[model samples]
Every structure is written in C-alpha cells, then in structure tokens.
Target chain A: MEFTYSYLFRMISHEMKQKADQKLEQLDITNEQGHTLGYLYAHQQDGLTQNDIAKALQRTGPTVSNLLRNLERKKLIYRYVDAQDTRRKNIGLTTSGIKLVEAFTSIFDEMEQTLVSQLSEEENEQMKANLTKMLSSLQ
Target chain B: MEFTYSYLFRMISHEMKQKADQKLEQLDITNEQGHTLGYLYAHQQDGLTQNDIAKALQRTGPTVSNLLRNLERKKLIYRYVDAQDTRRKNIGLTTSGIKLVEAFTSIFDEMEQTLVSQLSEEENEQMKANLTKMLSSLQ
Candidate 1:
C-alpha cells in the first residue's frame, strides 16, 4: 500500500530478484551464490582466494567457507595452487560458471541501461543527490 | 565503483540488507525467511494459506513449500485446518514469529522515515516519479 522510496526500492529490488531467479531457475542457483559468482567473474584475473572472497564480501570466514563449499559442490568453482606461492590456494570459476555469469551479466547490464534511459540527466542527478542524503541519514 | 541510479539503488538496498541481517543474526533467519515472516505479520487476520504466500512472494510453489517448511521447522509459522473447510489449511505466525516481525518492521519504518526526512517535498515527488518510470522501463 505504501509507495515511499523505501517501499519502491524494495519492490524494484524484489522484481530484479524475480527476474534473476527466473533466469537462474534451471541452473538451480541461489541469489547469494549468483552474487558470489558475479564477483568472481568480475575479478577473473585477480587470483583471489577464499580469504580474499570473504574480505570482498564483507562476510565472516565461516560464512564464506560455507558459501564456497556450496559453489564447489555445484562444480561452478575450483581451487588451484598459486604457482608463485605453493601454499596459497587461488579460486576460479569453471567453464560453465563463466558462461552462466557472462549470460546473467548481459541481462543485468541490459536492465541497468533500461533503468538509466528512463530518466533525464537532471532527474538522474537530483535523484542521486537525494538518495545519497538518505543513505547518509541511515548511517 | 559505478554510482548510477542502478548502482546507488543496489548500494542502498545492500546497506538495508546488512542492517537487517545484523539485527536478525542472533535469530538465525535468512533474508527470504524474514521477508516471508513480514508478509504474514501484515496479513495476520487474513487467514492466508501457503498458496497465498507463493502468490504474494511471486515464487514457485515448491520454492515456497521449502521456505515454509524451514519456517515451520523453526516454529515461526503454523498450519491449521480451516474451520469451515476442514481440508483447507490456513497459515499463521507463532508467538515468537509475531515478535520478530514486529521488531524488524519497527526498525524498517525507522529507516524509511529517515529516508523521507532527508528529502524535500518536491524532491520526494520527483524521486518517486522518476523511480516509477525506471521500474516500468525495466518491465
């Protein structure tokens, strides 16, 4: 019933989730897992490790461990020995993982462009300013 | 790094999720579970069923079934046979569930009011109008 910014933001976010889930339905992926895959996809060449993922995700080690475990079980990601540091284990997506992330990102980018194109330059600027203030207020 | 409307919206939404998660950490509820609980709280007197929940969430029946199963396992919701229709099962929140949902909603309302207070009346109108357009464009 409410149409405040908070409500609208939640509604839009939910819609985005629905779209993403519908696409990932057959893939049997969870939202968090998809987000983790996207993060890995963006940093494909970073040679990131489990610790790095935990830090980037701002989650606890145990949380990230469980997340990575699930992804690993699904065969979407794999661990490899860092050549320079034999003791270090770097993570990377598998072939199927890369394909899935790339496909989802394309749709994601398309949606973002659609949202951006809906507003005028001035409107975008003003909306950003207002949202920034609101975000600050929350903190 | 990007701060377009899409980026800002995602950031603000992420921040909100972090806040909610932190508060719900001790309760050990996932984001989706909390959302489902909130819906039940809002429609406490409506005698909603599992089908109602699936429809409200815009999720699949099996997905909702698993969600409700988890919630039921946690004793946050209960299924009771309808008085007039014995075969029909109506869902409602348990005592602890009601407490949790109400507590979260209060915090949720606090953040929403903060967002509204940061904006002028004109800014609020403009932002809402712009967001509405953006949402429609995405669809």
Candidate 2:
C-alpha cells in the first residue's frame, strides 16, 4: 500500500509543520522561533541561560544566538547578563513575548487535543506504546 | 505527563529527520532532496512533470523548481521537454540517481520495519486508524 506507516509518519510531520507555519505566519514567527519561545515560556521561572537553551533545544551555540537575536529584534525576548557572573546571558520573555507564547501555545495545544479527540482511551494508550517503542528503536 | 501525544509526535519526526539528514550527508544531499529523488524514482515510468511532483509533494511550484534545480545540478535528475508538449518538462532519474534512491529508500524501509516490529498487526491498524483520524481533523 502507498500509505504505509512510513508514508503516514512522513505526512503527519509534514502536515503538522505546514499547519504550524500557517498559524504562526499570522504572528510573523517561524516554527523554530516559536519552539524556542515556547521553551523559554515553559522555563521562564528557571531563568535559563542561552547555553542552557541551546542544550535543551539541541541546537548549536551560534544557531541559538542567532535565534535569540531575532527574538530580541522582534521584542519577544530579551537577554540579560547574569549578575553573579557576567559571562552568562539569561533569556527572558517580555510581556509581549509571554502573550505571543500564549497565542502560539494555544495552537499547539489545540492541535494536540484534536489528535487526542480522535482516539479512545485504549487506542490512545496503544498508539503511545507503539510510538514509544518505534521511537526508541529509531534512536 | 510531559510525554504527550504531541510531544512524541514532534520527537519522532525530529529524530527521523535528523537520522535521514545524517545518512544523506554522506551523499551530499539534504533530506528534502532525497525525498524528491525518491519520488522521481517511483514515478519515472509515468513521465511526471514538475507541477505533478509539486502537487504530489504538497509543495509550491517555485519550491519544487528550486529542488529540481539542485537535483539537476547534482546530476541525480534531468528534465526534458515532453515529446507531445514542448512547453512541459518531464523529470527523469539518472543511473546514479536510481542507485542513490535505492540506498536512501532502504533506510526508510528499514525504519518502517523497525516500527512495524514494535507492534502487533492489530496495534498497527489501530495506530494507522488513529493517525488518519487525526490527520483528517487537522486538514
């Protein structure tokens, strides 16, 4: 069959990414930037440094720096030097940043719920179990 | 739980793309290019045009044009004027292109088999059904 697990897996990601890009286009934020902003929002209380964000996002140092620069230019986030240690820069979301994050997050949550609503409890568990197994095998 | 369906879905695609990228790196091609070559390999017998490819890949005309340019530059694909329609160009794979597609597809097939190995036939059906439902809702 043309629609094997391989094809479905590919289409799901491609479609989701496109959906997210379309939704985020209204906010002038790309998917990668939205992901970074969402990460910062979820961990704002922790006051994570750029290095920490890079590590968490599994992006290179320079790539994260560029992303941070873009976010700063958009006024969605700002970076501050650590008071105790000048070497480290901590990332924080602005009020607008938080609001944008909220808007971006709602779309993701809505997408998740849409997927969730399609399955029964038992089927959800089965799918999750199957996905976990497949993911670990791939890794 | 942090391991929501959304989270797993994102991770699976991210990881799969990374794996594909790493493998294709040795061939000096990106995953997108690999996908294009794979598509051409499968549809070569039908003499598909670039527009047909773009529609099948769910990409824009210009994007597919750019992708074709890159593949053509790499000597993996070539375009020719259609015999019946001089205005249209049909895409074909080179011998090298066929070899690369075979190599690239093995990874995808192996990955699919790995996923299949993790599930019973019933669970596979359940997962596919759930995915179809989720994908339709998103659409």
Candidate 3:
C-alpha cells in the first residue's frame, strides 16, 4: 500500500529532476530552463508562444517570461512575429540554442533508454497505455 | 516518442503535486510537510529519530529540524528520549497528529485508488512491477 503508483512516480520525478539539475548547473541553466529548451526542441517544426510554453510547463506568466528572457539573453532562443499573424510573436531556438539543447538532450535520452531497455516492446506499449489512462483519470 | 516515459512521469508528478497542494492549502500545511507527516504515519511502529526522517525524506538536517519544530509547535508531533539510549531523541505523533495524518492520508488513498481502479487486477500488479523495475534503473 505504501509503495503505491503515485509514490513511485513522485520518487522517479524527484530523482530525474535531481539528475537534470546537476547536469544543467554546468550549462548555467536550471532544470526548468532545460525543460523549456527541451520542449522547444521537441516541437521545433511548430510555432510556440510564451503562453504555450507556460501552459505546457504549468508555469505562471511571469515565470515563463523570466525563463524566456534568460534563454534569449543566452542566445539560446529568440522571438519573432508569426508569418500567419504579424502581431503574433512566436518563440524559436537559434542555431547555438539547438546545439545547446542537443547537448543536454543526451541526458534525457540516456535516462529514457535505460527505462525502455528493461521492458519488452509489448510491455513498453502496455506501460505507456497504463500511464496514459492513469493520467487521464486524474485529469 | 515525444511523450516518452520520462515525460509522462513528469507530467503525472506535476499534476499530482498540484492536486496535493490544493488540498494541503486547506489544512494549512505545505505538500512537503504533508509528505513528512505521511512518512511518519506509514512507519508508526518503528522508533523514528529526527535523523531518520531527514534521510527518509531526503531532507537536510536543518530542514528536518525546522519541520519537526513547526509540527511540534502545532502539537501534532513531539520529541522524547529514546528507551535504549537516553542521549538520543525520538519523534512521535500525538493523538491529534494521528488524526491530522488520517485526514491527509485519505487524499493520498483516494489518488491511489483512482489509479488502481483503471487497471485490471493482473494489470495492476504488472504496472507496479514495471514501475519498480523502472525506479531501480534510475536509482
């Protein structure tokens, strides 16, 4: 009863964040900032606004603004007017930003690979299905 | 691939914490404080010292001490000299503390049940086994 699903998820999340923070410190970015970059990398083909990042990361407006400001200063990201709507500002990572993200992504890739390697292909799909269902129940 | 295991775990963890924080606010306790109390509740039969809690919760010495101090002030917990070693102090939850914990435990229990209810009985065990293996890989 004690080692419930929720408990395991929390421990894993905490451990993952700790590992990420240690690696991120050397890059002069915090874990959230790293996550922001990772998010952008994942959706590189699409346009994302500050609000999109804020909603995805569950961060407040000011918090997302601060994160964007810092990443922009580091030349890791940029803001530009969207082609479809000139008034709409979109966020994108620069070339150096992409390189920076690729550097940090290895850490996440390593972690994900370790988890996947333990299970069969069938079990991997099953686990993801279970997780999605569980997440949906809570949501 | 984008909704990887790590990503799903982080999302679920964030969702769980947000829910816990919302419930915890009504009880005048932070989510971490609720977790501390829950840890004591789970291991109530064992003689737990302050150092024990710090290690279990992955909290620093000062952080554990501060939590104990506040809980003690709230009259939910207390410190006493251990039986075998008079020099050592052990922590115990008061009657009020147990009641307070039971109140929060329901929230966790509810969340756990919601997760379990979605899966088949066999799938439930499978999920736990997969989670345990996944956790060990990271640890």
Candidate 4:
C-alpha cells in the first residue's frame, strides 16, 4: 500500500500481460492479436467491418489491417464482401477462430476468478468503485 | 463495480500510460525510456551498473543496452568505469539528465496528485490496499 500508484499500476499490468502471453504462446498468437480475436468473438454476430474493428479497438488502420491479414493467414478468421454493400468488407471468426477465442477466454476467465478470490466481496466492490472514479478523473 | 477485474486493470493502465506518453512527447522521450530515466534518477546516487539496471527494470540485456545507448547519445547520462571494479560500467545522470528527470518527475507527480484529488483519503488508502493484495495474489 505504501508503493506509488503508478508503479503498482505498471507492476500489475506487466504481471497480467506476462501471464496472458505465456498462455497465448501455446496458440501462437501475440497479445494484441489475442485481444483482436476476443473483440471479434464478442461482436462477430453483427458482422463487423474492418473499420469497425479498428475503431472499437482504438487501433490505427494499418495496424488493424496487418492483424486481420495475419489472422486470416492463420486460417482462424475470414473476410467477405458485405451482402448489402459490395464495397464493404465484413470480418468474422472461422471455426478454428472460435476455438482459439474459447481458449483465450478461459485463460482470462481463470485469471479473473483468481483475482476476485483474493479479496472479500466488500473489498472487491470498493476497489472497483474507486478505480472507476479514478479512471473517470484521469479521462 | 461489476466489471471483470482484468478489464478494470487494463483500462486504468492504458489511461495512465497514454497520459504519461503525451507529457513525455514534449521532452522527446518514449514511455519506456522515461521509465528508465526515472529508475536511474532514484538509484544513480548509489552508482548502479548496467546489469543492475537491467535487473531492476526487468528488461533484457540487449534492450537495456539499447536504451542506455540512446540516453547516452542524448547526453542525458554518462557511463564510467566503476571505481571498485574497473571492468564494470556504472551509470550516472548528467546535469542535463538531472534536469530531465526533474521535469519527468513533475509530470508523474502532477498526474498522481490529480488522481488522488479525485478520491477521499480513506478511499485512496482502501484502493491501494486492495490493489496491492490483488497484485500479490496474481504473482
């Protein structure tokens, strides 16, 4: 508790990322790529466009394009021309893509559960409330 | 308050990093580089070796080497043969390095103060306590 907030923020972030990356190594996906897959898994029912993914992920156009290309090359995802608008390209997960996302989701879910179990129900609520307020103030 | 702990951690980290990077832009330092500088500022009085820095920052040998090269090239720090062991190089901040670190420290201090200003003293203490506990559990 005596540690600086920013330092603690960084330490926690690094630890989570290390854990995620170790889990992701089995699937041969980088952390950013894993995040993209998770986002697509959660939203693909609506048939999102590449631009939509880029916007939602807050990534640049070229970065998202490269990620999509890599995922497609891995055969985990596919792109198609929009039925309603031929000029637009829609992205979705393939069967393998869904499976990969499931594996990734489980890793995150396990980590989350462990983190939650570390605190009492009341402590967890207070932490989240303070975090929400602090995040809003920073924004 | 109901959001996953992992999600909240990511949001807080991303916001803080973005804000820090923006402030660092004026000083022509990248976020990682700024962190290295800060670490050196805190420990340079003790005359830290490169290996010591690499270990402290949790960065690999080559990454810390490359970072040190960049900082040295900018004349913010200087490396000298350790008096106790001439075979090893120790790092110290130049006058310019001291001034640069001061500027960087102020940015973080201002941000930390702003974040603290958003919460009551008791709430801040609770958040830090919970964050520390959660981080330890994750580790």
Two-chain DockQ for each candidate model: 0.32, 0.41, 0.59, 0.51
lDDT of 3 by residue, B1-139 (tens): 4487877999999999888778878788876888898888888568898888999999898888999899999999988887878887789888988888888888788888988999999999989888998889888
TM-scores of all predicted structures: 0.50, 0.55, 0.59, 0.57
How many clashes in each structure?
Answer: 0, 0, 0, 0
How well is each residue in A1-139 modelled by candidate 4, as lDDT tens digits? 1777887887898899888878889888876888899899999877798888999889998888988988999999998777878987889999999999899889989998888898888987777888888878877
* Candidates 2 and 4, the one with greater TM-score: 4
Number of backbone clashes in candidate 1: 0
lDDT of 2 by residue, B19-109 (tens): 7667778777767778788888888778898888998899998888998888888888887777878888788998899999889888777
lDDT by residue (A1-139, candidate 2, tens digit) is 4366656766787888777778889988877888899898998678788888999889998898999888889899987776778887788999999999899888888877788778888877777878888888877
Whole-model Cα lDDT of every candidate shown, in order: 0.79, 0.81, 0.86, 0.86
Candidate 2 error regions (>4 Å): A30-94, B4-7, B14-109
* Fraction of native Cα contacts reproduced by each candidate: 0.48, 0.58, 0.76, 0.71
lDDT of 1 by residue, A23-132 (tens): 76866776677789999998958789888898888889889999999888888899998888898889999998898787767666776777767778787677778878
Q: What is the interface RMSD of each candidate, in Å?
A: 2.0, 1.6, 0.8, 1.2
Candidate 4 TM-score, true structure as reference:
0.57
lDDT of 4 at B114: 84
Q: Which residue window of length 10 is worst by lDDT in model 1 chain B?
A: B1-10
What's candidate 1's DockQ score?
0.32
CAPRI accuracy category, model 2? acceptable
lDDT of 3 at B8: 92
Candidate 4 per-residue C-alpha lDDT over B16-42 given as tens digits, one digit per residue, 9 for 90 to 100: 988887888899987688778888899
Q: Which pairs of residues collide in candidate 1?
A: none
Off by over 4 Å in 1: A1-10, A54-66, A81-89, B1-122
